[PDB]
Amino acid sequence: SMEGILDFSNDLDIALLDQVVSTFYQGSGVQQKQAQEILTKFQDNPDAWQKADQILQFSTNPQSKFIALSILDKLITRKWKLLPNDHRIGIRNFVVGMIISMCQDDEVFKTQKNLINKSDLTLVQILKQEWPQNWPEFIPELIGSSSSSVNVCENNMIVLKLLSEEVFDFSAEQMTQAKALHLKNSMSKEFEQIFKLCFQVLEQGSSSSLIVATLESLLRYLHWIPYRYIYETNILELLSTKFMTSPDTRAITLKCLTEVSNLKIPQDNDLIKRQTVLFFQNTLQQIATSVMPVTADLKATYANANGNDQSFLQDLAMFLTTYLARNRALLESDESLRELLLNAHQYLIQLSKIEERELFKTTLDYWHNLVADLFYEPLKKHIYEEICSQLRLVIIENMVRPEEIQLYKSEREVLVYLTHLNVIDTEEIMISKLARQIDGSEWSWHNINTLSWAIGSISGTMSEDTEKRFVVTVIKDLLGLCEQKRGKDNKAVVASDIMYVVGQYPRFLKAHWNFLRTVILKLFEFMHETHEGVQDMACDTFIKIVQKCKYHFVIQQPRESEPFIQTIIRDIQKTTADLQPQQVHTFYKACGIIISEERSVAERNRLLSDLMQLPNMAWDTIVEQSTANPTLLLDSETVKIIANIIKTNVAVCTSMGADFYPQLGHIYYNMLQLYRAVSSMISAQVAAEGLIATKTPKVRGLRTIKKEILKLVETYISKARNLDDVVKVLVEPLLNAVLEDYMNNVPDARDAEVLNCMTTVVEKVGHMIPQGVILILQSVFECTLDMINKDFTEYPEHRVEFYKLLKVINEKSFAAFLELPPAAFKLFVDAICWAFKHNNRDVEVNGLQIALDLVKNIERMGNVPFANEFHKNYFFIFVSETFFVLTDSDHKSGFSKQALLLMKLISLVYDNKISVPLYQEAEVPQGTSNQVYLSQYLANMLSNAFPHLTSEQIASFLSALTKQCKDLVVFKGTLRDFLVQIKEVGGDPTDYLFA
């Protein structure tokens, strides 16, 4: 029915197009989907643009005309320079004609802004091609045409706005460097004429819609125009006075003055300083008389969200912060500007109370800039004492949890500066807030949490003696608050906050052992509390206090019989009895932190074996049972116990690193035996039940055991200081346990954590086990590549760990790649090029890094038969595969690393670092240098890949690229110019002489 318009044999039925378009935009369900596919195939027809003047003349549907201009746009940007010059003049004349037509009809001008703005954007695509070289009179005629009609004048401001955007704001990606400079130079050459008209309209102030459009264009000009057009005219008075009084103009005017505050200005001119002060004084004066006084509740206004109030208050925040960040020093010395300075800051205080996370971040960046300055710059704080005092309450009342890292960091930083500036005011505000929790005035779970996070944030800013009296006052008040409240819910919230604050004040805990001990014994009591969150809070607080205070747990305190670590270890069974396994692992990790502080070896190893007693006796039991009967291991309860033992070892190993060796030695042999037993059980289940077995609880349980064993070994080796023992004791048993098991399992039974583990082994001791590295390649290389070389999605973990493994092997033990049979070395090159074509950035980045490191590895070999055979076999594969991903538009994230690799490959030939001819016997004359042959190969390659480029473009691109191959940033520029030119027809070949 609708598919008629797709038949180009006949004249286009406009009425049929209009139903297709109409049932797409206003239609529904299957009809609109069918219309969508029809309209898409229509505009993608390469001849569609020919039937464009028809649609703009004869169609009455604004959506049809919009789509007709889109079809035109696609032709102008891509195929314009291929057209006969009379088609170009035709298209220009009927776009200009359509625009003046729609401007002359007030009904159409009012009612079809979408279609007019789209026409203007199309005109600007033509200017980018034709102006000013083939259209010198465009600006003089635009300026003269503006005087005839207000509507035409308004639309001309929209054209100039779009032109400014396309040349200065969005040129970098979309045009060659040369074309950008040409259009920038042309716009600034004729800007004098444009500004006069701009200023004329604004002063004469005919119509608000025309004035809003002129100010919109001015906002774009302010991104690039020289400062003199703003300072040597009356325009600052207009922006800061008459346009701030009307709400139509006020929104755009404030955005303009924000960009004025960012202009590049000479910094030694007293008259310019006074002009900068004046527009601020005028702006703030209009706010106070026309919008809201300094005292207005902006929080309530913003919350009510009437009209454009939220946008206005967002823009006022941006204006004040921008201006005061740059200029507040202009207002700090004169006594007559003191009131202006503090009113502007009082507006920011009121803005800082708005409930809007992203606005608060904007005001908080400014407060940071201010209080940082008051802390260092001399004689400045006294000015801001009332501002800072209000700010203290605003930060504290709006404190977020440390989990929100960025905001919490920003808030802590500001509150710490404000504490340095007035300790007494900070302490008073926080004690007063605490009193309002106790009397119930401001009591809430949220309110006490907020206050706790705030009090916690300013730790380490007060003197030790001031901190002592403050901490004690807060803890006693929070303890009283807890006693006063009823119900596990209320008491748990206050107990968490007590425990939170204590954890934040380690200097206090270090100075008062009796208190630290009480705190810890109380955490041990809370580890028996079943109420939701308490055990996690108790364990989190425990390891937090230990990270900071570990030294006080490992020494003997003067009134104590033993170091407290020994006391923790004796009652560890009782203390952790009620914890979930993950909580028990945290607890053990905490003990490992303390034990690492013990520097006597005998004593560290004794505490380590004392701590690992329970897991070591559970272990000795389970290996005896597991060695006697392999059936007993299949039981779920035994798999969970074993996994929890290994995880306890990972936890303690994580905090002790090198010091964990004796405990690893104690379990190592039986653990690698268990790894094999568990491997067999997994394979046996995959045999009896199929691949579905890998998803059953018990096989996932078994695989957890293998993963936690590989995690334990990875964690130790990564931190090991005695690499001789790693090689002579750990590695050979490890390679024999994991490599063959990995190779000989079906893909779905292979653990990617094997590759991860091997990566670490090669990283730390690769240099010492060259035969071990070869055994790793033989075992994981071919079978892992086969898993990941069919698509980009399957085995995502294996894919990522695979290229980390090759990366580290290519860095530390390149010898292992020289030993590969040629066929397998070819697969190694295939595998790198495979990495290039990935979107997944972890694979892509490692892909390009291996390629770069491999090239340098071959370079280092000098003139040797292997380096020579590598270049003859693989050099052009690497150049052409790098060029493929540079130019295909689907790998733009890797542009920098692609560029670097290509530069390295091209620079090899232009430094004559490749000793052999790159060409086949009788492919070229006998003498010919690699330089000349590279030029021919590249010319031919790009000619076939991009047949619409001229020989002149390709030759010029390559002359620039090869001569610029010692200067990365410029090289990149040439590559970007080439990426622009492949997108169009008739690219100027001279554009590659920009650098």
């Binding site: 004690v472 303890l479 107990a495 007590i498 208190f515």
Partner: peptide, 19 residues
Amino acid sequence: DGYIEELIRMFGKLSIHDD
């Protein structure tokens, strides 16, 4: 001084009991 001892005494009685 004694007030650090008063903190220790008070901290010891901290509890989470349903009422």
